[PDB]
Amino acid sequence: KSDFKFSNLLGTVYRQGNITFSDDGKQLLSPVGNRVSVFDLINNKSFTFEYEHRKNIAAIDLNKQGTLLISIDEDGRAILVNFKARNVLHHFNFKEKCSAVKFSPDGRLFALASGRFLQIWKTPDVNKDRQFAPFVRHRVHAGHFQDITSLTWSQDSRFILTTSKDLSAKIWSVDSEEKNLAATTFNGHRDYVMGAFFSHDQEKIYTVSKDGAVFVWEFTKRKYSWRITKKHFFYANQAKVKCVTFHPATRLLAVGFTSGEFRLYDLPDFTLIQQLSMGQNPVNTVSVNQTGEWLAFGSSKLGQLLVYEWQSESYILKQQGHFDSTNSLAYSPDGSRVVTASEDGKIKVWDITSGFCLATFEEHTSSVTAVQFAKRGQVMFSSSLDGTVRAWDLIRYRNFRTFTGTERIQFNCLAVDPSGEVVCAGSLDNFDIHVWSVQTGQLLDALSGHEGPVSCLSFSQENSVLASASWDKTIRIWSIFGRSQQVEPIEVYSDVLALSMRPDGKEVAVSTLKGQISIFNIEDAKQVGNIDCRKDIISGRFNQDRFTAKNSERSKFFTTIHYSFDGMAIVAGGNNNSICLYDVPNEVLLKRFIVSRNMALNGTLEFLNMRPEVRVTSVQFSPTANAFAAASTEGLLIYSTNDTILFDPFDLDVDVTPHSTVEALREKQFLNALVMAFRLNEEYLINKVYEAIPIKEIPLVASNIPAIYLPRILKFIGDFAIESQHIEFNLIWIKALLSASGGYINEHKYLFSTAMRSIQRFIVRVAKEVVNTTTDNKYTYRFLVSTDGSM
Amino acid sequence: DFEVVEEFTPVVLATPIPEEVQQAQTEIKLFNKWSFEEVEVKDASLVDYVQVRQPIFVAHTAGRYANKRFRKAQCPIIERLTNSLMMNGRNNGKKLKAVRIIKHTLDIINVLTDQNPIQVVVDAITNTGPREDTTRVGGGGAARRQAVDVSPLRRVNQAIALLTIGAREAAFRNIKTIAETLAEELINAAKGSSTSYAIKKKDELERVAKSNR
Amino acid sequence: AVPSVQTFGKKKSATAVAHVKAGKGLIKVNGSPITLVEPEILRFKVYEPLLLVGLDKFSNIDIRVRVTGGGHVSQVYAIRQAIAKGLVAYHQKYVDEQSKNELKKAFTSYDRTLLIADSRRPEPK
Amino acid sequence: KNSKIFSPFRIIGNVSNGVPFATGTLGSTFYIVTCVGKTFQIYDANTLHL
Amino acid sequence: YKLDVLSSVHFVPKTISMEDAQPLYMSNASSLAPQEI
Amino acid sequence: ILLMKRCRDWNTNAKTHTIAQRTIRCILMHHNIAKLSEIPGMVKIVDAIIPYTQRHFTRVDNLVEQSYILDYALVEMDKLF
Amino acid sequence: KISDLENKVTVSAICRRRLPVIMHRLKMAETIQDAVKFIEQGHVRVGPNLINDPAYLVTRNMEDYVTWVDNSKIKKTLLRYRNQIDDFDFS
Amino acid sequence: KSNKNFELYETFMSLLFKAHGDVIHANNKNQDIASALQNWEDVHKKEDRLDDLVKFCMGVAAFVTTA
Amino acid sequence: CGNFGFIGSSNGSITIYNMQSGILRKKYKLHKRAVTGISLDGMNRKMVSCGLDGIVGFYDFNKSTLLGKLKLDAPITAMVYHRSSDLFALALDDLSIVVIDAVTQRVVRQLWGHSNRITAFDFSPEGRWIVSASLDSTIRTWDLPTGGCIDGIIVDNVATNVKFSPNGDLLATTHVTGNGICIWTNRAQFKTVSTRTIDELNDIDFNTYTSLEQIDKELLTLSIGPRSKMNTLLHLD
Amino acid sequence: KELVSQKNEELKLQINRVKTELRSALKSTEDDLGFNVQGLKFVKQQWNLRHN
């Protein structure tokens, strides 16, 4: 139930390193921060690998069979991963600095730029089992004078071109038996040579320099060896060559300069095919497809990534993260998209089924604080430190109100009632709670009441009470509607951060500064319980310390809380690198996740023998997806769950077996087979019996279903119907279900809430779109036949 | 069979605590005499407006029970009884006097008619509180009555006010005092005798409501 | 050198300082034992801090409580507050934290005015 | 006999059995090589990692 | 930048062209308010 | 084009709206399309016609979507007895 | 002040927002020579979070909440000398 | 006809119409394109059963959630 | 949660001590002979005692009552608990393995097969397999969903104890001889393996089910694949 | 919640009649609206195809 794996990573779409395509162009994998990510570019999706280096990552590749990746960090901690099942495989340590790695095209061997030398290793296998010492060093080469800046492989596995910062570009053979063929050293460029590539027919060797020279070495006469037959120049004014690649099978040379520009050429005649520019900050790495069509770029300063189809000059993805900022997030109450709000001062609207920033919102000057949706998730709000809060819609994607105080005061948090009328916000240095009407963008009232600065707000969802909470150790229940403005204070022991409210509107959870969580009833004012949470978070020993690693109350509190939509689990994170999640009725930790292991981040580990610092600033549960998002210093973190490999059944006994379910299905007792599979609660059995129930008895089974499996059935039908294909079968199942048992869920409204969100965002995301498309087709037919125009 | 042992030494503190107190530490009885267990409200529609689910030790739980609309329906019924009983011109803020006379009152309703005194006071409240009522409808100046109903909070409030002011009227200046006259009036209202001032006023109010309904 | 701990409690103007230390059971108010509290009808109001949890959590300690200021019933509320939060502080920092927040859950389940006081004054309507 | 789920990987916590371990030089790092029951291990002689 | 790095808790880092930051790919003035049109 | 100006005036309501939609229907199904395109200046008013009738289309679509609660009440009243 | 920011905002004012001299003007220490020792040992928070670098500029809206943490030796000995050590909330 | 990739065939047909359906409207009522898209709509007009289904289901879902 | 130690004696007295001071906290006394298996949920809400008179006690432990007392018909050597799926497995002395769940208290899986005393349990971390090593020198891997074996490794030495990794890739088995602890690597998380009973429908065999392309002809489908392809195709101008 | 629990064959026949005629009327006026908006968008798009 708390089997939260680390699935996706929205935000920071590329940080540092070299983007690489797969063996085909389907999977683009990128070196984000510590981990890596993989974007599936046809079945358009994304995931992020579960492993983690000990430092920042520096070079990635996967071999040409597509079945084995190796990533390698900034110092020599090689991670080797069996790619096709996402299991970490081997944990090697190369002894010194790595610059670039490259698999040979056959897959037997790989080559590594170890500073001034060059390493040549043969890979282990993936069909046989886990070895112990699987790396066999084939050969080292030590012919240079300075560090290697790149490698390229030949088409066959015979020759590599090592281009270095010393001005030689050297050709080196892979085996010593034919070493007398070509061990030569092409000099000649003015300053640093940053690339060297074979052609298709491997009789021509191009070498590209820093200043913008392209040299074409050829084996012609004046025994007779390796003259330079053609010289080309790029003629950028003060933009040196920053990255290069050369796909030989279509003769395409992509060169990105150090001023955000890239050009790309058909090389043997050297004609400029296409030239454009990305920004005012240098493109750091390039890559091509195996087949020349797709062509991806990664700029490292802002951290943005392009892909390019240059036959028809159009893109497929164009994303851009941030530079070390993610200050809040919010889901939509139909859980299909997620707003993040970034401390650089800009809003991004990702969608969780894709992994793409489908919208930026660049409006704010100063930093942003928090975001909050309202009214089923097509109106959102955003509060800044600039001095204003502002509305946005997610239909037109535009502002329509900019609420401000008349005083130029920043804000810290905000909230909005479900009946989308009033908007409250909470500041830092005027101690008040402002409310604006969202119908007419005016200040309704300066709703005062506290003695100090407020820190966290929430409106309810059933009575729409306000629950403010402030650093005078006080939370404050407000009722602002209907002639009253009723105030009721509740007084906690220590200082107070981080309020959240249960979605049934009956109680409110609040963190403290004395490492605790409390829950308060709000029609009463008594407590229910306090979860003590100051012994189970491990902050990191800073590199700027005299004290110890545990006793120092650095982040022994919880800066952000959220409830879950069933009402029991509470997820909580603070300025330390520990995400906890609890339940309320038993006051125990379900689980604790460390968020990261970057020793580049200062307070990360416990025993390290200014800086970027690990931090988690906003955590929320999904309204349907059974995932939770954290907003770390890295980016958005998505821990997802599943009905998969965990075998957590529901009152089975001796006779219910999957064999028994499938024989009851073939003996056609369909309701007994369905409850026999839902008692078992296993993924393939549920899916098999659900598909294999035919159509003429869906009323029978949906009427004689029990009254205790219904939220599980609704949740499964929704979370299978989103990414299913049988949309008329899903719609028949839902029609039968909430026609046969419609009143019962209406009298038991609350425990169906995390299912009825799902099958409603199943409808308004794919089914209504398909239905208005066939609506438009019917109307265009009816027009094109009913009218008559013969010019 | 089943057994759970938690304490092992005979716990006796260095100060001698009375045996009735360390007997009450097992289960909280009211005034260390009366269990809030086995008290049920024999009527419906006044549960969760009387409150006999919290065993207190003495009717002086001085929490804030009036700064909301309906949150004076959760402090317990005998604390509302002694607080409604405390008020007249001769006494305001004499709450320890009010507590000691409610102590004598429930003690002597035990010594007369032992059901248990909180059971007696709870079904006394249920039988006392009226069920239909009249209001002055406007009509421009005509003194026409009209029949309405009463919410359970109004029933409980008017029940404790009728019991208290009936004991006031029954020991204003005659032989007995407020303690034993609250005892006798409350056992009459608990039995349903129609001799107490409370059921006299309930029957009068329901009679005029029935008449000009 | 004994393990001592000191807590404060206050209703309207009365003040109660409580010294909980490892003893043998005795519980004192101005020297006089806890059986003799002055107003004689709120003696159970001062008992119920040491009656919600059982006397076996008081077998190992002894409590001396000085009380000045305030009226009668404000003094006895101050003593019950000092007794309760002194017991939970002694169990916070000298025996197990599970026993500490078990006591704290029991007190905040009875009523949280046994631990902290609503010490913020009125509403200007 | 032969398994189908679990392949045997490494006997750990065992450094010898009683067989005389041998030694040798891989250039710089002297390696000792020990016998444990059914398999053999190889240790370095500078750090005594394996 | 230099002011909030001095006065903040956490650190703060800072021809033919294109742009990676946009409101939407799909709508593109086919989503306008009818009152404004 | 005068009647089309009147239709564009009538279109931006919810009471005077179905009249405008059936007027533009009768014109559109009883005239020539190249005639309606090369009438001078008759795109500067149909570009104001189309978003209002799109908004009304989604509104009547949402209302006919909401009309299925009578179907739900019928299947529940059938399930009652 | 609008145009006379040319003359007053100098080193003696832009260093007056520093956490040692704000500490010394708040009389939380004897002098800067041990105020830097305290805030380098990591005893002093501002707002909710602890601050360790002794070059921090406490802003205008945070000067009110630059106070010692709970569970620290100096807070313990301050409350001991005042003899008000309410040991329920950790110190 | 076969009910497979229904959204893709609908968007192919709408792509056809808004790409160069102007010639279809122009020499409309020719026998060839008339009978061609006539049997196309004789197959297509069965495909409002899911229209009726979603207009049921979204309304009943909103009703049993809210009220 | 680490604040409670549980001790099961040779006279039925199970004592529950607090941990970080060592004082006794509570003492349950249900059995009349010795106690062999004690465990407790993650929620601190259901604890299980399992004594070799043959009886299993389900207690609440947040109150102090019991709320279940199942009897069985064999003595019990050992117990193990899978906390993530509220299940727990019992050795018996008619050589069966009985796994039962700590909510509904049924006898949910009865696993025969072994021929001598079993001496090692472990639940795999996903709760799909148990591994049992037994004094006929065998190691059998039971899949409790099908309630059947998968393989039996006949190891030459008798395997004393069998544990898993927290992330289910390693078996740590110690045998009766050999000083070291043998380590086994599974091929579990690399590929799905069959579910076929051994001695001496392929979808439910290999524990996966692909979705068929359509149910029948009159049931519509969508594009088998992505969903933004339709929007890109309708708006790509 | 009372309209379900009522027992009246006349009332449920009346509900069926009201339902089918109301949905016929609303689908008719939606037919008018959709046919108009698609014809008008064709008119505009072919004008722009002429001389955008």
PDB file of C-alpha atoms in Angstrom, chain A residues 301 323-325 343-344 365-366 610-611, chain E residues 1-14, chain G residues 57:
ATOM      1  CA  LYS A 301      23.707  26.784 -18.609  1.00  0.00           C
ATOM      2  CA  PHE A 323      18.717  26.617 -12.681  1.00  0.00           C
ATOM      3  CA  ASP A 324      18.347  25.239  -9.135  1.00  0.00           C
ATOM      4  CA  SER A 325      14.767  26.242  -8.354  1.00  0.00           C
ATOM      5  CA  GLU A 343      11.991  30.294  -7.514  1.00  0.00           C
ATOM      6  CA  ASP A 344      13.531  31.969 -10.564  1.00  0.00           C
ATOM      7  CA  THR A 365       9.507  39.605 -11.576  1.00  0.00           C
ATOM      8  CA  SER A 366      10.643  38.305  -8.199  1.00  0.00           C
ATOM      9  CA  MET A 610      28.071  28.565  -0.253  1.00  0.00           C
ATOM     10  CA  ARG A 611      27.032  25.158  -1.520  1.00  0.00           C
TER      11      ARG A 611
ATOM     12  CA  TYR E   1      21.590  38.668  -7.308  1.00  0.00           C
ATOM     13  CA  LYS E   2      24.415  39.875  -5.075  1.00  0.00           C
ATOM     14  CA  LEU E   3      21.917  41.315  -2.592  1.00  0.00           C
ATOM     15  CA  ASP E   4      19.829  38.202  -2.064  1.00  0.00           C
ATOM     16  CA  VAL E   5      22.898  35.958  -2.023  1.00  0.00           C
ATOM     17  CA  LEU E   6      24.217  38.166   0.763  1.00  0.00           C
ATOM     18  CA  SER E   7      20.774  38.185   2.420  1.00  0.00           C
ATOM     19  CA  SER E   8      19.271  34.745   1.758  1.00  0.00           C
ATOM     20  CA  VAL E   9      19.434  31.338   3.385  1.00  0.00           C
ATOM     21  CA  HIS E  10      19.868  29.074   0.377  1.00  0.00           C
ATOM     22  CA  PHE E  11      22.153  29.839  -2.522  1.00  0.00           C
ATOM     23  CA  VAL E  12      21.019  31.581  -5.716  1.00  0.00           C
ATOM     24  CA  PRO E  13      22.915  30.571  -8.897  1.00  0.00           C
ATOM     25  CA  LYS E  14      22.904  33.474 -11.399  1.00  0.00           C
TER      26      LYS E  14
ATOM     27  CA  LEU G  57      22.530  39.851   6.450  1.00  0.00           C
TER      28      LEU G  57
END
